Amino acid sequence: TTAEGVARVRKSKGKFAFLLESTMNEYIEQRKPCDTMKVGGNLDSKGYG
Amino acid sequence: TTAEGVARVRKSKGKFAFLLESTMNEYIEQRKPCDTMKVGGNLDSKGYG
């Protein structure tokens, strides 16, 4: 689950990075404790239907 | 023209920055005299048709 990926980033002291959709990334970047960040450009361009 | 924007960056001693598509930016970054760089993420995501 996405939540598990977020936890792994948050708990791994910088030793795990998570590949996920920009929408989810940007959402989590605005949630406490505000310890994650989106870096780089997006790797592709698509949409939800 | 794009060429004019490139020239303006190259000749302006750091006092001009040019907003252009990532494709053109990345191409010029690999042309002599290798004095320009793409910085930051892309501002949008789109395509040529």
PDB file of C-alpha atoms in Angstrom:
ATOM      1  CA  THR A   1       0.000   0.000   0.000  1.00  0.00           C
ATOM      2  CA  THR A   2       1.046   3.588  -0.483  1.00  0.00           C
ATOM      3  CA  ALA A   3       0.916   4.081   3.281  1.00  0.00           C
ATOM      4  CA  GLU A   4       3.544   1.367   3.705  1.00  0.00           C
ATOM      5  CA  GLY A   5       5.815   3.125   1.187  1.00  0.00           C
ATOM      6  CA  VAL A   6       5.417   6.417   3.045  1.00  0.00           C
ATOM      7  CA  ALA A   7       6.271   4.731   6.331  1.00  0.00           C
ATOM      8  CA  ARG A   8       9.351   3.151   4.819  1.00  0.00           C
ATOM      9  CA  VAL A   9      10.611   6.518   3.607  1.00  0.00           C
ATOM     10  CA  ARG A  10       9.888   8.156   6.938  1.00  0.00           C
ATOM     11  CA  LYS A  11      11.504   5.458   9.092  1.00  0.00           C
ATOM     12  CA  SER A  12      14.550   4.613   6.976  1.00  0.00           C
ATOM     13  CA  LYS A  13      16.802   7.612   7.830  1.00  0.00           C
ATOM     14  CA  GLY A  14      17.218   8.549   4.173  1.00  0.00           C
ATOM     15  CA  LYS A  15      18.075   5.024   3.045  1.00  0.00           C
ATOM     16  CA  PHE A  16      14.819   4.399   1.190  1.00  0.00           C
ATOM     17  CA  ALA A  17      13.201   6.437  -1.551  1.00  0.00           C
ATOM     18  CA  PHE A  18       9.747   5.651  -2.907  1.00  0.00           C
ATOM     19  CA  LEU A  19       8.571   5.797  -6.528  1.00  0.00           C
ATOM     20  CA  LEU A  20       4.932   6.857  -6.655  1.00  0.00           C
ATOM     21  CA  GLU A  21       2.526   9.022  -8.572  1.00  0.00           C
ATOM     22  CA  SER A  22       2.996  12.776  -8.296  1.00  0.00           C
ATOM     23  CA  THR A  23      -0.548  13.236  -6.987  1.00  0.00           C
ATOM     24  CA  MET A  24       0.109  10.985  -3.974  1.00  0.00           C
ATOM     25  CA  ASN A  25       3.582  12.432  -3.497  1.00  0.00           C
ATOM     26  CA  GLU A  26       2.293  16.010  -3.436  1.00  0.00           C
ATOM     27  CA  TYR A  27      -0.466  15.078  -1.038  1.00  0.00           C
ATOM     28  CA  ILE A  28       1.922  13.478   1.443  1.00  0.00           C
ATOM     29  CA  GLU A  29       4.310  16.425   1.169  1.00  0.00           C
ATOM     30  CA  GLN A  30       1.571  18.506   2.816  1.00  0.00           C
ATOM     31  CA  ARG A  31       0.900  16.070   5.670  1.00  0.00           C
ATOM     32  CA  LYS A  32       2.546  16.069   9.080  1.00  0.00           C
ATOM     33  CA  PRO A  33       5.260  15.679  10.029  1.00  0.00           C
ATOM     34  CA  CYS A  34       6.242  17.355   6.748  1.00  0.00           C
ATOM     35  CA  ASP A  35       9.380  15.249   6.432  1.00  0.00           C
ATOM     36  CA  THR A  36       9.088  14.088   2.814  1.00  0.00           C
ATOM     37  CA  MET A  37       9.610  15.801  -0.491  1.00  0.00           C
ATOM     38  CA  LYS A  38       9.067  15.238  -4.185  1.00  0.00           C
ATOM     39  CA  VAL A  39      12.320  15.541  -6.123  1.00  0.00           C
ATOM     40  CA  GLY A  40      13.068  15.647  -9.794  1.00  0.00           C
ATOM     41  CA  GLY A  41      10.740  15.902 -12.720  1.00  0.00           C
ATOM     42  CA  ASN A  42       8.021  13.407 -13.367  1.00  0.00           C
ATOM     43  CA  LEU A  43       9.162  10.317 -15.308  1.00  0.00           C
ATOM     44  CA  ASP A  44       6.008  10.117 -17.450  1.00  0.00           C
ATOM     45  CA  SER A  45       2.711  11.962 -18.105  1.00  0.00           C
ATOM     46  CA  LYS A  46      -0.639  10.275 -17.808  1.00  0.00           C
ATOM     47  CA  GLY A  47      -3.964  10.397 -16.051  1.00  0.00           C
ATOM     48  CA  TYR A  48      -6.605   8.631 -13.999  1.00  0.00           C
ATOM     49  CA  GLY A  49      -9.863   7.610 -15.635  1.00  0.00           C
TER      50      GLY A  49
ATOM     51  CA  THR B   1      13.552  32.430 -32.308  1.00  0.00           C
ATOM     52  CA  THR B   2      14.972  29.908 -29.893  1.00  0.00           C
ATOM     53  CA  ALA B   3      18.448  30.671 -31.216  1.00  0.00           C
ATOM     54  CA  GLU B   4      18.030  34.297 -30.160  1.00  0.00           C
ATOM     55  CA  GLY B   5      17.053  33.197 -26.638  1.00  0.00           C
ATOM     56  CA  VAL B   6      20.114  30.955 -26.430  1.00  0.00           C
ATOM     57  CA  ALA B   7      22.346  33.806 -27.559  1.00  0.00           C
ATOM     58  CA  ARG B   8      20.848  36.114 -24.974  1.00  0.00           C
ATOM     59  CA  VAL B   9      21.568  33.641 -22.192  1.00  0.00           C
ATOM     60  CA  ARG B  10      25.093  33.047 -23.427  1.00  0.00           C
ATOM     61  CA  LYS B  11      26.007  36.718 -23.870  1.00  0.00           C
ATOM     62  CA  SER B  12      24.319  38.227 -20.814  1.00  0.00           C
ATOM     63  CA  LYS B  13      26.841  37.214 -18.093  1.00  0.00           C
ATOM     64  CA  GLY B  14      24.165  35.480 -16.029  1.00  0.00           C
ATOM     65  CA  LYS B  15      21.713  38.376 -16.206  1.00  0.00           C
ATOM     66  CA  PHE B  16      19.234  36.653 -18.517  1.00  0.00           C
ATOM     67  CA  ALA B  17      17.502  33.318 -18.105  1.00  0.00           C
ATOM     68  CA  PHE B  18      15.352  31.792 -20.829  1.00  0.00           C
ATOM     69  CA  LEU B  19      12.062  29.912 -20.427  1.00  0.00           C
ATOM     70  CA  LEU B  20      11.798  27.206 -23.071  1.00  0.00           C
ATOM     71  CA  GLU B  21      10.702  23.645 -23.590  1.00  0.00           C
ATOM     72  CA  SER B  22      12.755  20.949 -21.885  1.00  0.00           C
ATOM     73  CA  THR B  23      13.478  19.241 -25.207  1.00  0.00           C
ATOM     74  CA  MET B  24      15.178  22.358 -26.615  1.00  0.00           C
ATOM     75  CA  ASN B  25      16.874  23.078 -23.300  1.00  0.00           C
ATOM     76  CA  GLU B  26      18.350  19.580 -23.073  1.00  0.00           C
ATOM     77  CA  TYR B  27      19.516  19.733 -26.658  1.00  0.00           C
ATOM     78  CA  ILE B  28      21.358  23.017 -26.152  1.00  0.00           C
ATOM     79  CA  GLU B  29      22.901  21.747 -22.916  1.00  0.00           C
ATOM     80  CA  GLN B  30      24.808  19.243 -25.072  1.00  0.00           C
ATOM     81  CA  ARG B  31      26.048  21.796 -27.619  1.00  0.00           C
ATOM     82  CA  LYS B  32      29.304  23.724 -27.490  1.00  0.00           C
ATOM     83  CA  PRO B  33      30.431  25.699 -25.684  1.00  0.00           C
ATOM     84  CA  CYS B  34      28.522  23.772 -23.001  1.00  0.00           C
ATOM     85  CA  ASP B  35      27.833  26.924 -21.009  1.00  0.00           C
ATOM     86  CA  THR B  36      24.099  26.536 -20.350  1.00  0.00           C
ATOM     87  CA  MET B  37      22.106  24.344 -18.033  1.00  0.00           C
ATOM     88  CA  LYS B  38      18.539  23.328 -17.334  1.00  0.00           C
ATOM     89  CA  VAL B  39      17.569  24.073 -13.738  1.00  0.00           C
ATOM     90  CA  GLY B  40      14.558  23.166 -11.700  1.00  0.00           C
ATOM     91  CA  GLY B  41      11.718  20.853 -12.490  1.00  0.00           C
ATOM     92  CA  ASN B  42       9.527  21.297 -15.497  1.00  0.00           C
ATOM     93  CA  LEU B  43       6.615  23.720 -14.965  1.00  0.00           C
ATOM     94  CA  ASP B  44       4.104  21.613 -16.923  1.00  0.00           C
ATOM     95  CA  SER B  45       3.800  18.276 -18.784  1.00  0.00           C
ATOM     96  CA  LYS B  46       2.689  18.062 -22.372  1.00  0.00           C
ATOM     97  CA  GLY B  47       3.683  16.878 -25.804  1.00  0.00           C
ATOM     98  CA  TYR B  48       4.186  17.651 -29.474  1.00  0.00           C
ATOM     99  CA  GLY B  49       1.716  16.319 -32.014  1.00  0.00           C
TER     100      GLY B  49
END
